[PDB]
Amino acid sequence: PTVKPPTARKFIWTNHKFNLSGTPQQYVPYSTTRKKIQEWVPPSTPYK
Amino acid sequence: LHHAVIPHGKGGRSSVSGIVATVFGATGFLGRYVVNHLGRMGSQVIVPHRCEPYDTMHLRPMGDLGQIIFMDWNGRDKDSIRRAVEHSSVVINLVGREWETQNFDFEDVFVKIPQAIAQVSKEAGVEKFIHISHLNADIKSSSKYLRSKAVGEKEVRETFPEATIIKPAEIFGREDRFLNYFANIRWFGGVPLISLGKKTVKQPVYIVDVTKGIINAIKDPDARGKTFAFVGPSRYLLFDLVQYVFAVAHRPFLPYPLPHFAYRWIGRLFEISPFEPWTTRDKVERIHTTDKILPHLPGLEDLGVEATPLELKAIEVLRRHRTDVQPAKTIPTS
Amino acid sequence: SRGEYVVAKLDDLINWARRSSLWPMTFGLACCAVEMMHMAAPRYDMDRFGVVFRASPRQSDVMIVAGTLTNKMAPALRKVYDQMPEPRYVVSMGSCANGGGYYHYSYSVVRGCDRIVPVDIYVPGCPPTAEALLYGILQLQKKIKREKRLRIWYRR
Amino acid sequence: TRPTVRPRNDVAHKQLSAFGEYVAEILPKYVQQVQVSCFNELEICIHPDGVIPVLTFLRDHSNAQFKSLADLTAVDIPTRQNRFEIVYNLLSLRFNSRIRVKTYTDELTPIESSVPVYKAANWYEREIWDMFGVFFANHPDLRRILTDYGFEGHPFRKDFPLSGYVELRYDDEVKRVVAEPVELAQEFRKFDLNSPWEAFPAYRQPP
Amino acid sequence: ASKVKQDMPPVGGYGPIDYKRNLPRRGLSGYSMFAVGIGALLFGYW
Amino acid sequence: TYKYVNLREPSMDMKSVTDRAAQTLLWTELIRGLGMTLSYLFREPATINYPFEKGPLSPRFRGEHALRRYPSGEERCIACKLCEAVCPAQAITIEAEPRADGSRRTTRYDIDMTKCIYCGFCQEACPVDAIVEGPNFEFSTETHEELLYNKEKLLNNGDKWEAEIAANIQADYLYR
Amino acid sequence: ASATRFIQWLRNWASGRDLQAKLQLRYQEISKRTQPPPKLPVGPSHKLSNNYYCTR
Amino acid sequence: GVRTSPTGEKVTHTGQVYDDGDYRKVRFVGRQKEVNENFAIDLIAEQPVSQVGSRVISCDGGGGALGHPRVYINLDKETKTGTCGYCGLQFRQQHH
Amino acid sequence: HQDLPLGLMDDIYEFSKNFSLRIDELEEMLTNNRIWRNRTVDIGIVTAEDALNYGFSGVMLRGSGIQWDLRKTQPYDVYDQVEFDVPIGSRGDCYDRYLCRVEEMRQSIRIISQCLNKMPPGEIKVDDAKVSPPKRAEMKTSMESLIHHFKLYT
Amino acid sequence: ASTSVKPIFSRDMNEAKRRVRELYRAWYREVPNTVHLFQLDISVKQGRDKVREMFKKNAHITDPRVVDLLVIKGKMELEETIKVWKQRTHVMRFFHETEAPRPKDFLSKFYVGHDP
Ligand SMILES: NC(=O)C1=CN([C@@H]2O[C@H](COP(=O)(O)OP(=O)(O)OC[C@H]3O[C@@H](n4cnc5c(N)ncnc54)[C@H](OP(=O)(O)O)[C@@H]3O)[C@@H](O)[C@H]2O)C=CC1
Ligand SMILES: CCCCCCCCCCCC(=O)OC[C@H](COP(=O)(O)OCC[N+](C)(C)C)OC(=O)CCCCCCCCCCC
Numbered sequence A: 001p002t003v004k005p006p007t008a009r010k011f012i013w014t015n016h017k018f019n020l021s022g023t024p025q026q027y028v029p030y031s032t033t034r035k036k037i038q039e040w041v042p043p044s045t046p047y048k
Numbered sequence B: 001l002h003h004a005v006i007p008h009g010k011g012g013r014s015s016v017s018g019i020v021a022t023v024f025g026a027t028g029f030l031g032r033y034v035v036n037h038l039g040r041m042g043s044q045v046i047v048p049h050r051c052e053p054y055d056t057m058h059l060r061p062m063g064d065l066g067q068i069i070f071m072d073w074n075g076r077d078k079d080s081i082r083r084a085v086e087h088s089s090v091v092i093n094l095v096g097r098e099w100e101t102q103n104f105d106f107e108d109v110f111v112k113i114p115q116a117i118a119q120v121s122k123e124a125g126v127e128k129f130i131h132i133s134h135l136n137a138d139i140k141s142s143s144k145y146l147r148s149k150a151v152g153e154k155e156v157r158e159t160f161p162e163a164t165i166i167k168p169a170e171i172f173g174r175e176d177r178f179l180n181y182f183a184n185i186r187w188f189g190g191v192p193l194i195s196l197g198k199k200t201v202k203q204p205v206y207i208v209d210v211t212k213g214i215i216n217a218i219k220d221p222d223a224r225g226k227t228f229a230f231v232g233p234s235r236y237l238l239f240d241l242v243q244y245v246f247a248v249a250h251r252p253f254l255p256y257p258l259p260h261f262a263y264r265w266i267g268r269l270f271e272i273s274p275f276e277p278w279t280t281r282d283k284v285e286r287i288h289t290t291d292k293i294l295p296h297l298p299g300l301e302d303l304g305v306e307a308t309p310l311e312l313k314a315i316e317v318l319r320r321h322r323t324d325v326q327p328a329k330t331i332p333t334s
Numbered sequence C: 001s002r003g004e005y006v007v008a009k010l011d012d013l014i015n016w017a018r019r020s021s022l023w024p025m026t027f028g029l030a031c032c033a034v035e036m037m038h039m040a041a042p043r044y045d046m047d048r049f050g051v052v053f054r055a056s057p058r059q060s061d062v063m064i065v066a067g068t069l070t071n072k073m074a075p076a077l078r079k080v081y082d083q084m085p086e087p088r089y090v091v092s093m094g095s096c097a098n099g100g101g102y103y104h105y106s107y108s109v110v111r112g113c114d115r116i117v118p119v120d121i122y123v124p125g126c127p128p129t130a131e132a133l134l135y136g137i138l139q140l141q142k143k144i145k146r147e148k149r150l151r152i153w154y155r156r
Numbered sequence D: 001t002r003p004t005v006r007p008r009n010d011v012a013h014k015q016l017s018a019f020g021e022y023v024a025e026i027l028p029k030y031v032q033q034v035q036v037s038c039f040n041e042l043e044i045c046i047h048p049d050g051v052i053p054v055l056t057f058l059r060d061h062s063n064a065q066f067k068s069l070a071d072l073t074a075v076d077i078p079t080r081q082n083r084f085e086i087v088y089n090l091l092s093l094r095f096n097s098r099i100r101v102k103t104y105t106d107e108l109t110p111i112e113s114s115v116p117v118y119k120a121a122n123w124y125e126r127e128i129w130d131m132f133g134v135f136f137a138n139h140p141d142l143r144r145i146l147t148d149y150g151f152e153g154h155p156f157r158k159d160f161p162l163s164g165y166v167e168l169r170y171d172d173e174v175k176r177v178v179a180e181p182v183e184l185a186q187e188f189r190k191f192d193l194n195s196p197w198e199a200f201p202a203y204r205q206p207p
Numbered sequence E: 001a002s003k004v005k006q007d008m009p010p011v012g013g014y015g016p017i018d019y020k021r022n023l024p025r026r027g028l029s030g031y032s033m034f035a036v037g038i039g040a041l042l043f044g045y046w
Numbered sequence F: 001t002y003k004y005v006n007l008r009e010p011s012m013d014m015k016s017v018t019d020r021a022a023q024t025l026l027w028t029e030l031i032r033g034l035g036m037t038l039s040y041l042f043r044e045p046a047t048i049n050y051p052f053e054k055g056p057l058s059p060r061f062r063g064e065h066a067l068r069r070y071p072s073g074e075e076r077c078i079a080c081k082l083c084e085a086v087c088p089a090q091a092i093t094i095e096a097e098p099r100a101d102g103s104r105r106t107t108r109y110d111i112d113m114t115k116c117i118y119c120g121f122c123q124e125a126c127p128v129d130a131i132v133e134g135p136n137f138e139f140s141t142e143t144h145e146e147l148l149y150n151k152e153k154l155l156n157n158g159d160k161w162e163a164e165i166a167a168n169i170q171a172d173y174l175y176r
Numbered sequence G: 001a002s003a004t005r006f007i008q009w010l011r012n013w014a015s016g017r018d019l020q021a022k023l024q025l026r027y028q029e030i031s032k033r034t035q036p037p038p039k040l041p042v043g044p045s046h047k048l049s050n051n052y053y054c055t056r
Numbered sequence H: 001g002v003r004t005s006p007t008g009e010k011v012t013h014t015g016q017v018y019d020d021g022d023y024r025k026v027r028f029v030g031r032q033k034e035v036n037e038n039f040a041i042d043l044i045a046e047q048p049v050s051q052v053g054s055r056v057i058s059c060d061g062g063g064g065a066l067g068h069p070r071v072y073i074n075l076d077k078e079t080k081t082g083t084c085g086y087c088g089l090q091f092r093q094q095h096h
Numbered sequence I: 001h002q003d004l005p006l007g008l009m010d011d012i013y014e015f016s017k018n019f020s021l022r023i024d025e026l027e028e029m030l031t032n033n034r035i036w037r038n039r040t041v042d043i044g045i046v047t048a049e050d051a052l053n054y055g056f057s058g059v060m061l062r063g064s065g066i067q068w069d070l071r072k073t074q075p076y077d078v079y080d081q082v083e084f085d086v087p088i089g090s091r092g093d094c095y096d097r098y099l100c101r102v103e104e105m106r107q108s109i110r111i112i113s114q115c116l117n118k119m120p121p122g123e124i125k126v127d128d129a130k131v132s133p134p135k136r137a138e139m140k141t142s143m144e145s146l147i148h149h150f151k152l153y154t
Numbered sequence J: 001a002s003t004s005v006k007p008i009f010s011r012d013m014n015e016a017k018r019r020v021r022e023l024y025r026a027w028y029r030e031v032p033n034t035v036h037l038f039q040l041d042i043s044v045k046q047g048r049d050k051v052r053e054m055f056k057k058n059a060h061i062t063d064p065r066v067v068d069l070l071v072i073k074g075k076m077e078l079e080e081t082i083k084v085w086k087q088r089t090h091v092m093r094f095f096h097e098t099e100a101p102r103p104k105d106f107l108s109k110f111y112v113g114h115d116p
């Protein structure tokens, strides 16, 4: 890299991170999509 | 998954049961059976642990990916308990110990810690709370183990009124300290007993029955703010019971009496070690205490659990102690 | 000094010994066993870390599940695990042992060896290169180095 | 020539056609159909009663000497009443040729074991039994070869689910591996890939 | 507008590659191995 | 053409029979084996000093999957699902919708790295070089759940490994 | 290749063969790891006329 | 452009965030929620609009064979910019 | 899938020069070693007629003296344009099968020597985009190519 | 005709029923040996009950050929048990000890899920 440096991009990490498995900053999977079905919210005041 | 959590699926490993449980003391004898049943139906189980993560490994296979979650906690740190119950809808306390340690005595494991969990659970918004007590719990006995249980049971019933107290007898199973306790008296001589096992009546209960009872208390609505007494189907004399254990284990049975004070001293000798004591003064008292008969408390039959007779599932426990057995004489109901 | 300090050095000594003599029992079930053999080959020479090529199950400290675990083989693998003297660790090698991999949806494949035995390190790949497996063994050694068996005992 | 197209071999198509008639004439009692594919592979379709007669002739006859059983398998076509198609692939080292013999059966009708002709069929027939449920009569030792002990069903049948009906798992309460109904965290995604436009007009079936 | 460049052998091809078995013949004959062996015994006996 | 491997007749002249007698009694051929392993003792070993030395790889090496961007920061993936349709192990799960500005982008892009067979078909099928297999091969984890990547993990890998992915693609894009 | 002449003779004699001609370790006779860019050829069907697909 | 929910959890670029009463937040206790910080929708807005002198411009994403399939964008409508369907770059026609 | 990268064939040549010497070292440990011959000679003998009827193939036949090799009797690809020999056993035992395998490695090096010299130019996949996907360069410029790339991968 | 078909072993129900009993006697006499070799935690009587139940579920069969297959498969199962090809896990898969009972009443199904 001192002879052929990498191309610079503004989204590339400036700080390389080693394997974080087993540490408090590990990766935890989850769904990245929002809720599909919207349920009905009953009225907050009585009818009678 | 908006109001509580909606069950989904067939009730198998990859289903969703809607139960989000925090099981304190899940790394012990009764804990591994409670986690197995919760995780076997598709529940989100949170397992606080004080031990090495290596000692929690037998719990990882018990649930689908992401269903068993492990946290560090300290019995004397209220914040850690808060992090482990804030997201749960049911909290199960199985914290206990058969002996006192330099850092934890019976007033910590059975009174202060259970009350700490109950308080944090109440203000965290948890709706259901299951606490394990002892059948012979009352402040009148020579066992400091049983005196602590009575105090803790009252404090749990006060901090969390809607709690569900379970009062089981001596639980037997593969990893129990009851049938395996009456099988390790062979390297010293016969079988010491207060009196000769007479005037001591025991009503042991199967581990799966206790486990299945705790599960049904989570699902059952009419179990909030109630006390249960999980007991076996049959009653035995400690002499007859221990005789049966040795017969099933094919060990020579040579019972001889020993004075009550004499048994205390050998209990002192075996509690000087730094490891799990083989026996102690309190252990001898509890084994020789007579299992109370509380017919005013609903038991296993009130949760849809048929108590398992000790004769049916005693061979699976004592098989490993061996190097057509007559059932033990039982006390009639009368 | 404090009791924690004294019992923390003994923890280091036993942790050092156990990770410097990791003897593996390799369940070579499928192609991932070839890459396991390449980690013993001269280029990587796993024996230079103290990791003997192949120990008997009763002398073994770590089990490497390297390949597809089928239903027919599942009870056999559990029996070998139950007979391993402690402390015992399991390394899941490859996609088949990780989560079933290419045969995840088969009628005769266990969907991950972590339904039968507990797993300490998962090594991804199909197969992981011999260097990737070695990186996973050196991660298990780092995991043994972080154990606190005596601290937990002391603070009990 | 045409660089991207497979060249024909009309000499080998002629020879295999002649040998097919030869076999059809010598065994009219069983042979039901003979065909040669566009890539020069001879198929003899026979009645299942002719399995031993037809195979023995091809193995022993001086002009056949099909002394190797390359493979023996089954194909499940549910739309036929005889849903299974038993296929024999034979090799002749003397004449450097291959022949395929096909027959059929259903879930209940036995097939005759060709172990007396080719010893290699011992395990091939067990695999057919294990994976398709076709019973071979007079087999010296017929039993499952590939499936788990006590496995219910025959997986290679077209109506058997891909992921089966049971999955294994270790239960700590009973301290053993147990079988339970299959539940997949992610269901297999069934793709419908067929194009609605005919690809090969040469194979169009009559309306 | 350059030329096609793909992986090809050098002009003139590669050099010859040995494949035939090569186990060289070593040592003395059977007669001379027993002569040295017997002679060693005789000197030792003396 | 063919050759016989073991079809030679041993000579029966007295010299040859004595040459074979010397071999049997004096263990001559067992002593060549000792010479061949003494040779290897004085050859330099082929072992490398991992992890300070690494085994050589090539720009085509197939490692950890990762999601890339254009030079402007915009994601390359336009939620076409060709990678999902070709994955032999059915390890990719994609969901998509119109982004806030009308663009065609994924709301879900998961890869089950325990189903993946690390075959590279996805990066073959992608028309915009979005999903690639980077050069990383050291991402072993301690739990099964860390290998179920979602869109954030894959985008993080792309930002983390773009400097090296871009140079590997530049070295090999003319062969593909 | 860094072995001295003496150890070279010993390894050669014990094996019976000249090992230094064919070493199992790769020194600087292998291809450079950065190669010039290629320019691959096109197939027989890359034509602008007389290339109808029904004929091939 | 990572926004934080009232409880404190980061909102991902897909808009995902767990509600206040969702038990699934327990997976992040003792761990972290991995959220990519570079929102694509925000970075492609920063790119300047390109002024071209023709009705139809072609975009291939930049880089030739390393970009995306080459598409032609019509710029006759003066009330909006012509956006590339693959990469989001915008174009406008000079004074018409 | 792809074409050979520049510099590979020179690296295959360098590996192939030395590989016969590696086989000769293997033979210095096994072929004449009496202990190895005791474990393999006259062990597991298969008659040529049993081998054919039991469905054997490969050196399980050539070890018993059967002269059969699909690379020469039913050649595929360009095996009819290379020159090599088929090793044949005489006793049908483990030792003869071990010598067939070791001799097949020597013949494989012989074939590799001819592939390296006779490697021709051209493309590496059939120039029919309804079977083999087009190059990425033309998948990103031509409408037909993108259609055929799209449908060959879905 | 259409109804003419090859027999597997038995030409009518009477001959097939003979093979069923011969199989039942072989199974009935191996439960004590099976419960001993595999060190099962079940009793001999409930082991023989399971044998009876398996013979009872498919007791409505009237096709002689289907009966032959059920006996062919039954003998294969017996051979695996006698030879100890099976293990403790395979013998106990007849008892479904780990899956909770699925209620069979309409109301109980209605509360848990959408299945009939
Ligand atoms: N088993 C029986 O026979 C009987 C059980 N009970 C009661 O049920 C409860 C659990 O029973 P059981 O599982 O058999 O007992 P165990 O000894 O097998 O397990 C006790 C659990 O509590 C944990 N524990 C003990 N002290 C502490 C502490 N200071 N801080 C945190 N955790 C602690 C232990 O964690 P760790 O392992 O890491 O130390 C362990 O997980 C007890 O309260 C007991 O009184 C009631 C009647 C009979
Ligand atoms: C008095 C009680 C007896 C035990 C004495 C201590 C021995 C154990 C420590 C070595 C292992 C270790 O510590 O590992 C290697 C260490 C570095 O470890 P680190 O990465 O800094 O540790 C990080 C923290 N951990 C370990 C908790 C994760 O290397 C050293 O510099 C040690 C070299 C000097 C050792 C001298 C031993 C002399 C004692 C001989 C008689 C017992």
Ligand code: SF4
Pocket: C030, C031, C032, C066, C067, C068, C093, C094, C095, C096, C097, C101, C102, C125, C126, C127, C128
């Ligand atoms: S993970 Fe890949 S290499 Fe390993 S056994 Fe499975 S298919 Fe083979």
Ligand code: SF4
Pocket: F065, F086, F087, F088, F089, F090, F091, F092, F111, F115, F116, F117, F118, F119, F120, F121, F122, F123, F133
């Ligand atoms: S590399 Fe292969 S298995 Fe992995 S995601 Fe891509 S297509 Fe699927």
Ligand code: SF4
Pocket: F076, F077, F078, F079, F080, F081, F082, F083, F084, F094, F125, F126, F127, F128, F129, F130, F131
């Ligand atoms: S990664 Fe590529 S192939 Fe996959 S959906 Fe995105 S653009 Fe399509």
Ligand SMILES: [Zn+2]
Pocket: H059, H060, H061, H068, H084, H085, H086, H087, H088, H089
């Ligand atoms: Zn663009």
